[PDB]
Design a protein around this ligand. Structure first.
Ligand SMILES: *[C@@H]1O[C@H](CO)[C@@H](O[C@@H]2O[C@H](CO)[C@@H](O[C@@H]3O[C@H](CO[C@H]4O[C@H](CO)[C@@H](O)[C@H](O)[C@@H]4O)[C@@H](O)[C@H](O[C@H]4O[C@H](CO)[C@@H](O)[C@H](O)[C@@H]4O)[C@@H]3O)[C@H](O)[C@H]2NC(C)=O)[C@H](O)[C@H]1NC(C)=O
Ligand SMILES: *[C@@H]1O[C@H](CO)[C@@H](O[C@@H]2O[C@H](CO)[C@@H](O[C@@H]3O[C@H](CO[C@H]4O[C@H](CO)[C@@H](O)[C@H](O)[C@@H]4O)[C@@H](O)[C@H](O[C@H]4O[C@H](CO)[C@@H](O)[C@H](O)[C@@H]4O)[C@@H]3O)[C@H](O)[C@H]2NC(C)=O)[C@H](O)[C@H]1NC(C)=O
Ligand SMILES: *[C@@H]1O[C@H](CO)[C@@H](O[C@@H]2O[C@H](CO)[C@@H](O[C@@H]3O[C@H](CO)[C@@H](O)[C@H](O[C@H]4O[C@H](CO)[C@@H](O)[C@H](O)[C@@H]4O)[C@@H]3O)[C@H](O)[C@H]2NC(C)=O)[C@H](O)[C@H]1NC(C)=O
Ligand SMILES: *[C@@H]1O[C@H](CO)[C@@H](O[C@@H]2O[C@H](CO)[C@@H](O[C@@H]3O[C@H](CO)[C@@H](O)[C@H](O)[C@@H]3O)[C@H](O)[C@H]2NC(C)=O)[C@H](O)[C@H]1NC(C)=O
Ligand SMILES: *[C@@H]1O[C@H](CO)[C@@H](O[C@@H]2O[C@H](CO)[C@@H](O[C@@H]3O[C@H](CO)[C@@H](O)[C@H](O)[C@@H]3O)[C@H](O)[C@H]2NC(C)=O)[C@H](O)[C@H]1NC(C)=O
Ligand SMILES: *[C@@H]1O[C@H](CO)[C@@H](O[C@@H]2O[C@H](CO)[C@@H](O[C@@H]3O[C@H](CO)[C@@H](O)[C@H](O)[C@@H]3O)[C@H](O)[C@H]2NC(C)=O)[C@H](O)[C@H]1NC(C)=O
Ligand SMILES: *[C@@H]1O[C@H](CO)[C@@H](O[C@@H]2O[C@H](CO)[C@@H](O)[C@H](O)[C@H]2NC(C)=O)[C@H](O)[C@H]1NC(C)=O
Ligand SMILES: *[C@@H]1O[C@H](CO)[C@@H](O[C@@H]2O[C@H](CO)[C@@H](O)[C@H](O)[C@H]2NC(C)=O)[C@H](O)[C@H]1NC(C)=O
Ligand SMILES: *[C@@H]1O[C@H](CO)[C@@H](O[C@@H]2O[C@H](CO)[C@@H](O)[C@H](O)[C@H]2NC(C)=O)[C@H](O)[C@H]1NC(C)=O
Ligand SMILES: *[C@@H]1O[C@H](CO)[C@@H](O[C@@H]2O[C@H](CO)[C@@H](O)[C@H](O)[C@H]2NC(C)=O)[C@H](O)[C@H]1NC(C)=O
Ligand SMILES: *[C@@H]1O[C@H](CO)[C@@H](O[C@@H]2O[C@H](CO)[C@@H](O)[C@H](O)[C@H]2NC(C)=O)[C@H](O)[C@H]1NC(C)=O
Ligand SMILES: *[C@@H]1O[C@H](CO)[C@@H](O[C@@H]2O[C@H](CO)[C@@H](O)[C@H](O)[C@H]2NC(C)=O)[C@H](O)[C@H]1NC(C)=O
Ligand SMILES: *[C@@H]1O[C@H](CO)[C@@H](O[C@@H]2O[C@H](CO)[C@@H](O)[C@H](O)[C@H]2NC(C)=O)[C@H](O)[C@H]1NC(C)=O
Ligand SMILES: *[C@@H]1O[C@H](CO)[C@@H](O[C@@H]2O[C@H](CO)[C@@H](O)[C@H](O)[C@H]2NC(C)=O)[C@H](O)[C@H]1NC(C)=O
Ligand SMILES: *[C@@H]1O[C@H](CO)[C@@H](O)[C@H](O)[C@H]1NC(C)=O
Ligand SMILES: *[C@@H]1O[C@H](CO)[C@@H](O)[C@H](O)[C@H]1NC(C)=O
Ligand SMILES: *[C@@H]1O[C@H](CO)[C@@H](O)[C@H](O)[C@H]1NC(C)=O
Ligand SMILES: *[C@@H]1O[C@H](CO)[C@@H](O)[C@H](O)[C@H]1NC(C)=O
Ligand SMILES: *[C@@H]1O[C@H](CO)[C@@H](O)[C@H](O)[C@H]1NC(C)=O
Lengths: 102, 112, 453, 132, 128, 132, 48, 48
């Protein structure tokens, strides 16, 4: 089975800054998807195929990396973006990192 | 009238980092004869403007690869790859597709 | 010297990838059978002898079979000429009458259930005033209960009145040679080791493909295009669970499907010149239609595909099989055609094993359905008529259509399961060698000559 | 004997060979370029697409100096911003499919250059003929 | 647009069997797969299985076999052929199975696997 | 700079200009002359009318001395009963649409004169080549 | 702009085309719930 | 008008009228346009 490990756990910041999110796989040569779930809402898609964007996603969301390392860098943090962020490869999900205000 | 808008207003660039100056027209600039009629000019303050990039994604007879032209219809980007001390000045975007010829508002680049 | 000049060159070998409309080439030997006993034997083009399969030395070409076209066009037009052979045939509207059905005369045991219903109804004759009282026979998968007494109706009578199929035409597969039009070549990959994607370093150009048999089987592909040396498995991302693994194996496994009821036909007249063929009496015994494969041959073939599957999932992996967990009647079953009647078998004595890294026949109990809703369109079906006598065919199982099982645990086993699904996956076992390129002459190259004045 | 099937190749025969051996036989790709109730309209829209895209290549060829000559020099110089390759390699090093990737940005600049270099040469032929 | 409307929340007993509708509308239902994702607290997301609704070919998870069953019902009328409904019968519940159940769908995207699910259901919470 | 959209006109661009400025650019009307279940037959009978009336003009051009040269002198003299105009005007006074009214009776006399003046020139080229 | 054929003719319409638009607001305020009557096999008929 | 019936002097040509075509094509299409003039016309089923 592919297992996915999210690094930072709770990443607390302030709005306006830039956060990175590093997710580590266990099988190289695949895609990646990044799911954002706010508090008490329906989750939404951000990234697929490690680089592209969903329908109606601002261009401050960008993800890169290949092999077994995959980064999701968010520039110019809003107040809405403090949510849980999920990795997903083929069926397996990460446990989810959390963004909190400072 | 067609509008030539230039982004950004002014850039303070480091020598070596790739710089980008963008300009957008009101419509596409591809003509049936086979050339894209979007141009780019260099002007020093107190000096007459000189042509840099004609028929974009092709260099002129005297400019190196420090300047580049790319983009598509209605979206034009001038890319300055390697910055020298002589790279400072005001750049202009201008169309030679239709009459009249409209110019950009001007993009100043200075030294740090 | 350095004053190089442009010289154009017309008629120069280069190609780009493209997609345009291809056409048939039916074999000329099948032209003797008169006036469309199968679809598309007068409609499209007579073939050529000895097609110029010519090698292309020192050529590599990036093939693909999953994002390939011409298996999308082949699914499109075969739907369309299936509709071409039903517009002459008789619409079967006045059969939607409230039937009255009893058990067929048979030794009704409580363990078994009635496979054939009697269903005597009323139907107009050729005169508009009189109404004859005729009887027929119907399978249990064609009648539902209108709810003392017990009166049924046809299953498709809700929402889709649909045509008969004329017994002049025949549903047998004839070969179809797809040919490119003028200005387009068809590259054929001659590599004996070639999965789905990837550069094929030995190509060859044809103008017409080899004989493709359009068959309709969901699982257990039939009658076509065995492999060269090994048993080749091929997919998209093999760590994905929604993309089928089209196994295509090397030696064929002979299947022996039959139907042993005699099933005498009779003709009920709907109106003026519109006959309707219903099965009358059945002579002999009421026996279940089945299929056979040799257990010594089939288990040996699963011994091959369990070796090549370990090349993608590592060794010491306990590979097991199962029997297609759920679905409709045409995907949980081995659904195929045989002589003009539509068998739905039960591959659950086949795909049931487990394998660790260290003369008799298997009988598959099939069942027959008469109305047919291939490709699941909204307002169509096709009442296939009965056919006389015992029906028997012999086919080669050539490839399976497996599907992995989407685990999320730290297990070792990988329970593969068969599943038909989309009908395109049958034709991707025939059109993976071929891509279609567009010949693009009129190149340009610099050399040292100038047009003198 | 005389006449063998070895060097007398077929359609797309030299498709991997170098340009100096592909321009030896260009006629074999040339002559197999035109010849070779609803599935008759799949025959019609396959035929009038073949004769249309053949005439389109015979028109772009026609308005340059090359009516049917099939190999012809021209007058435009070869600017090294296009290809920047040596001459002594690209007739025995590369192959034609490797060339078509190497130049595909710069077509429709060459095709636009060729028409003006013909029509300038066309009326200048008339001005030479008009004074005498 | 694409809309997936689920069913309301339920209260079940250990040993019962839920049924969670997922009515799809706004696209051709005979083309795109429908998956089912269960979201458990303290465990993250978890997959269940898809249903290719042309014929109804399903495939479940490995650790949920024998306890889940997904059927579908198409739209058999040419006046309105887009809508449809998928189901899920999750049998043999447990107090360790109380979670939120989502029906999803892949995006019409063509560089895009079956798993990058674009449009989601509203979410059905199930308490045991 | 070099390359402007002023004098580089488009399709039918010089349609009111004089003949001496319309014959400067004839290629722009030349190249946009071929390229650019019942409404597909409105596509078919629009396409095979375009490629047919293009070939008809390429045949009447072909059997004169002008294969694809697009401007070519000939040998027939200009009888003044046709036009009776001065030469020094009709390249900078008139325009082409004013010319087409002024001559339209006398076509199919010129088109008949051109074929015989070519075929007489054709076999006389052979009789010069045959004796030597 | 008004435009016609012979304006002293009485059988040729005068196509007036005016310059600023005049906004019309047509409506129908019955709710008019539909229902489907089944004619036969797969032939629905929609009646109010 | 006036179809150009023009003589061919010093020409002999081997004709045939029994293995001739175009009397086979004429029988083919006259059958077909006889069917073209019956598809608009009314089917006469309820007279039986
Ligand atoms: C595709 O093909 C497969 C393979 O045959 C089919 O699977 C079989 O389905 C049948 C029908 O459900 C199964 O038959 C049933 O088996 C049960 C288990 O049998 C064991 O236990 C009984 C005592 O309980 C022993 O006598 C027996 O020897 C076994 O040890 C039985 O309990 C069932 O019998 C009960 O029901 C019948 C009918 O009501 C009564 O007549 C009986 O008296 C009793 O009450 C029944 O015999 C069979 O086991 C399946 N095969 C397997 C699991 O390998 C698929 O069904 C078929 N596909 C489709 C779609 O049908
Ligand atoms: C299942 O497996 C298949 C194949 O086995 C994978 O499909 C490939 O996926 C990769 C990566 O997603 C694709 O590569 C991408 O190609 C795009 C198109 O490039 C075309 O043109 C080039 C040049 O001619 C060809 O070499 C190429 O093959 C294509 O034909 C590019 O736009 C992409 O670049 C973008 O993404 C990368 C990485 O994010 C960035 O670095 C770039 O800057 C750019 O943003 C990329 O190169 C490839 O085309 C796919 N097809 C094939 C046939 O290989 C599936 O991804 C895989 N799926 C899963 C879920 O695992
Ligand atoms: C895989 O390929 C095999 C190839 O052998 C194929 O088996 C053959 O199928 C054909 C037709 O599908 C069978 O041919 C029939 O043979 C019987 C007995 O000879 C004939 O009576 C049949 O004629 C019938 O049809 C005529 C026209 O409709 C009627 O006029 C006539 O009265 C009959 O009703 C027909 O010729 C053939 O017997 C088998 N078997 C062999 C060994 O050839 C098999 O079907 C293919 N599998 C699939 C799934 O397609
Ligand atoms: C389906 O049900 C029908 C309706 O009963 C069956 O048809 C009828 O079967 C009976 C019994 O065989 C026939 O009756 C016999 O007729 C002969 C000749 O008239 C007579 O000598 C016998 O004494 C007996 O009465 C009957 O003719 C026959 N047909 C009709 C129209 O009633 C039919 O057999 C059933 N289907 C199958 C497959 O058996
Ligand atoms: C794949 O194989 C399994 C065997 O492991 C099949 O399961 C068996 O299916 C039959 C019929 O579906 C079941 O018989 C009936 O079960 C129902 C209740 O589900 C009952 O009402 C009937 O009286 C009868 O008992 C049988 O119990 C079941 N066995 C097991 C162990 O699950 C399955 O059907 C096969 N799949 C296909 C597509 O053939
Ligand atoms: C799928 O594979 C399994 C595992 O091989 C098969 O289960 C086994 O089937 C055999 C044959 O019925 C059982 O043998 C027993 O034989 C005795 C004496 O002949 C008889 O009294 C029993 O009633 C039974 O037939 C064996 O116990 C059984 N094993 C298990 C664990 O169930 C299964 O039959 C295969 N499926 C099909 C459709 O063949
Ligand atoms: C076929 O038509 C006959 C003739 O009408 C039907 O027979 C009658 O049916 C009605 C309605 O059930 C009864 O009230 C009459 O008593 C019947 N008469 C006779 C002589 O049977 C018959 O029901 C129709 N259907 C079938 C299946 O036979
Ligand atoms: C059309 O008729 C069919 C046949 O009865 C209907 O299918 C059944 O509908 C009942 C509803 O009470 C269900 O309980 C059965 O399970 C259905 N049968 C099957 C095989 O699914 C169908 O619902 C009717 N309507 C439409 C729109 O198809
Ligand atoms: C089909 O074959 C090709 C070529 O062998 C495979 O492509 C490479 O396979 C290796 C094997 O792990 C990967 O590491 C590479 O990333 C693949 N791509 C490239 C561009 O080298 C391909 O994986 C095979 N596909 C299947 C389903 O087996
Ligand atoms: C299936 O039933 C038919 C009907 O009886 C059988 O055909 C008969 O065959 C015998 C000799 O074989 C002839 O004398 C009869 O005239 C035939 N009857 C008809 C109606 O054709 C046929 O033989 C049976 N099938 C098999 C395999 O025995
Ligand atoms: C399927 O049926 C065919 C023909 O009915 C079988 O082929 C025959 O097999 C026997 C047994 O070895 C031979 O004696 C015959 O010569 C074979 N005939 C032909 C025409 O091949 C075949 O063996 C059967 N296969 C299975 C698995 O039952
Ligand atoms: C089923 O398999 C047999 C065995 O391979 C096929 O018979 C071969 O047919 C080809 C076609 O010309 C011959 O070249 C081989 O010599 C045959 N082999 C044997 C052992 O007879 C048969 O064609 C396959 N298909 C069908 C429909 O029966
Ligand atoms: C449309 O406009 C034209 C041009 O202005 C009109 O043509 C002339 O109009 C005058 C006005 O009285 C007449 O005396 C002339 O006889 C017209 N013809 C010519 C050739 O000069 C035309 O009448 C206008 N039509 C309408 C309906 O207003
Ligand atoms: C026209 O009538 C329909 C039918 O009552 C109204 O639709 C209802 O709207 C209420 C809330 O607005 C819902 O609770 C009902 O379920 C709806 N019924 C149906 C059948 O959809 C509709 O609102 C009315 N139109 C207007 C403008 O009020
Ligand atoms: C007839 O078929 C029904 C179908 O359920 C069955 O229950 C019944 O036992 C059969 N036999 C008789 C005599 O009704
Ligand atoms: C199937 O074939 C393998 C191959 O060696 C053999 O070992 C085994 O006994 C066969 N029979 C089974 C699994 O019933
Ligand atoms: C699995 O076994 C085969 C036996 O042929 C061997 O070649 C292969 O290397 C083994 N796999 C690994 C990962 O060692
Ligand atoms: C053609 O242009 C694109 C961008 O305009 C560039 O990426 C590519 O390298 C160019 N092709 C060649 C052969 O240089
Ligand atoms: C052409 O001929 C007609 C009568 O044959 C005559 O009226 C007309 O004036 C002529 N055209 C010119 C331009 O003279």
């Amino acid at each position: 089975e592919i297992v996915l490990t999210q690094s930072p756990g709770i990443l607390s910041l302030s709005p306006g800054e830039t956060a990175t999110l590093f997710c580590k796989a266990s099988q190289g040569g695949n895609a990646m998807t990044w799911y954002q779930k706010r508090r008490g809402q329906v989750p939404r898609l951000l990234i697929y195929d490690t680089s592209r964007r969903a329908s109606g996603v601002p261009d401050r969301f960008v993800g890169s990396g290949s092999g077994t390392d995959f980064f999701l860098t968010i520039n110019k943090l809003d107040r809405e973006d403090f949510a849980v962020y999920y990795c997903q490869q083929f069926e397996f999900f990460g446990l989810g990192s959390e963004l909190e205000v400072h | 009238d067609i509008v030539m808008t230039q982004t950004p207003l002014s850039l303070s660039v480091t020598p070596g980092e790739p710089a980008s100056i963008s300009c957008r027209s009101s419509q596409s600039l591809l003509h049936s004869n086979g050339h894209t009629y979007v141009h780019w000019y260099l002007q020093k303050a107190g000096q007459s403007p000189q042509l840099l990039i004609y028929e974009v994604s092709n260099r002129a007879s005297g400019v190196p690869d420090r300047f580049s032209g790319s983009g598509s219809g209605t979206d034009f980007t001038l890319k300055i790859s390697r910055v020298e001390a002589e790279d400072v000045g005001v750049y202009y975007c201008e169309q030679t597709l239709q009459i009249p010829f409209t110019f950009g508002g001007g993009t100043k680049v200075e030294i740090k | 010297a350095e004053n190089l000049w442009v010289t154009v060159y017309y008629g120069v070998p280069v190609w780009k990838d493209a997609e345009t409309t291809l056409f048939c080439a039916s074999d000329a030997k099948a032209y003797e059978t008169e006036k469309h006993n199968v679809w598309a034997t007068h409609a499209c083009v007579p073939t050529d002898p000895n097609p110029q399969e010519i090698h292309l030395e020192n050529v590599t070409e990036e093939f693909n079979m999953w994002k390939n076209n011409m298996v999308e066009q082949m699914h499109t037009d075969i739907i369309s000429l299936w509709d071409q052979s039903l517009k002459p045939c008789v619409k079967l509207t006045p059969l939607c009458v409230t039937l009255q059905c009893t058990n067929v005369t048979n030794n009704i045991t409580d363990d078994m259930r009635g496979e054939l219903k009697n269903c005597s109804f009323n139907m107009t004759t050729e005169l508009r005033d009189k109404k004859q009282k005729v009887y027929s026979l119907f399978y249990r998968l064609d009648v539902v209960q209108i709810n003392s007494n017990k009166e049924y109706r046809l299953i498709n009578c809700n929402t889709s009145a649909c045509t008969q199929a004329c017994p002049k035409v025949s549903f047998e597969p004839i070969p179809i040679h797809y040919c490119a039009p003028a200005g387009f070549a068809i590259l054929k990959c001659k590599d004996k080791k070639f999965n789905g994607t990837g550069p094929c370093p030995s190509v060859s150009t044809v103008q017409c493909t080899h004989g493709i048999k359009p068959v309709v089987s969901t699982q257990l592909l039939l009658n076509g295009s065995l492999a060269e040396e090994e048993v080749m498995i091929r997919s998209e991302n093999i760590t994905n669970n929604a993309k089928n693994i089209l196994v295509q194996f090397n030696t064929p496994v002979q299947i022996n499907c039959t139907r042993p009821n005699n099933n005498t036909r009779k003709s009920i007249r709907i109106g003026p010149g519109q006959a309707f063929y219903a099965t009358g009496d059945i002579i002999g015994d009421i026996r279940q239609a089945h299929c056979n494969v040799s257990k010594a041959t089939w288990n040996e073939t699963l011994g091959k595909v369990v070796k090549q599957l370990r090349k993608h999932f590592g060794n010491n992996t306990i590979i097991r099989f199962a029997n297609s967990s759920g679905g409709d009647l045409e995907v949980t079953t081995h659904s195929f055609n045989c002589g003009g009647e539509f068998f739905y078998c039960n591959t659950s004595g086949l795909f049931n094993s487990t394998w660790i890294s260290n003369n008799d026949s298997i009988t598959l109990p099939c069942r027959i359905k008469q109305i047919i809703n291939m490709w699941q369109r909204i307002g169509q079906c096709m009442y296939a008529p009965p056919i006389q006598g015992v029906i028997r065919c012999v086919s080669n199982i050539t490839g399976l259509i497996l599907t992995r099982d989407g685990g999320s645990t730290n297990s070792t086993t990988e329970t593969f399961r068969p599943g038909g699904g989309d009908m395109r996956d049958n034709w991707r076992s025939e059109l993976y060698k071929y891509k279609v390129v567009k010949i693009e002459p009129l190149g340009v190259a610099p050399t040292r000559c100038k047009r003198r004045v | 004997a005389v006449g063998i099937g070895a060097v007398f190749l077929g359609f797309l025969g030299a498709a991997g060979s170098t340009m100096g051996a592909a321009s030896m036989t260009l006629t074999v790709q040339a002559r197999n370029l035109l010849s070779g109730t609803v599935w008759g309209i799949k025959q019609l829209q396959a035929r009038v697409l073949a004769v249309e895209r053949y005439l389109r290549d015979q028109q772009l060829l026609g308005i340059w100096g090359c009516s049917g000559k099939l190999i012809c020099c021209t007058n435009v110089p070869w600017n090294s911003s296009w290809s920047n390759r040596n001459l002594s390699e690209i007739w025995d090093n590369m192959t034609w499919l490797q060339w078509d990737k190497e130049i595909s940005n710069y077509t429709q600049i060459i095709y636009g250059l060729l028409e003006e270099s013909q029509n300038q040469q066309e009326k200048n032929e008339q001005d030479l003929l008009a004074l005498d | 647009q694409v809309q997936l409307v689920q069913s309301g929340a339920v209260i079940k007993t250990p040993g019962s069997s839920v049924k969670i509708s997922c009515r799809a509308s706004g696209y051709n239902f005979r083309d795109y797969s429908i998956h089912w994702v269960r979201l458990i607290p303290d465990k993250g997301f978890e997959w269940i299985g898809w249903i290719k609704p042309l014929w109804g070919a399903v495939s479940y998870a490995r650790q949920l076999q024998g306890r889940v069953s997904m059927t579908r019902q198409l739209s058999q009328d040419p006046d309105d052929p887009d809508w449809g409904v998928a189901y899920m019968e999750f049998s043999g519940l447990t107090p360790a199975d109380t979670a939120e159940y989502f029906c999803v769908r892949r995006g019409s995207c063509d560089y895009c696997g079956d798993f990058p699910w674009q449009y989601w259901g509203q979410g059905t919470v199930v308490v045991v």
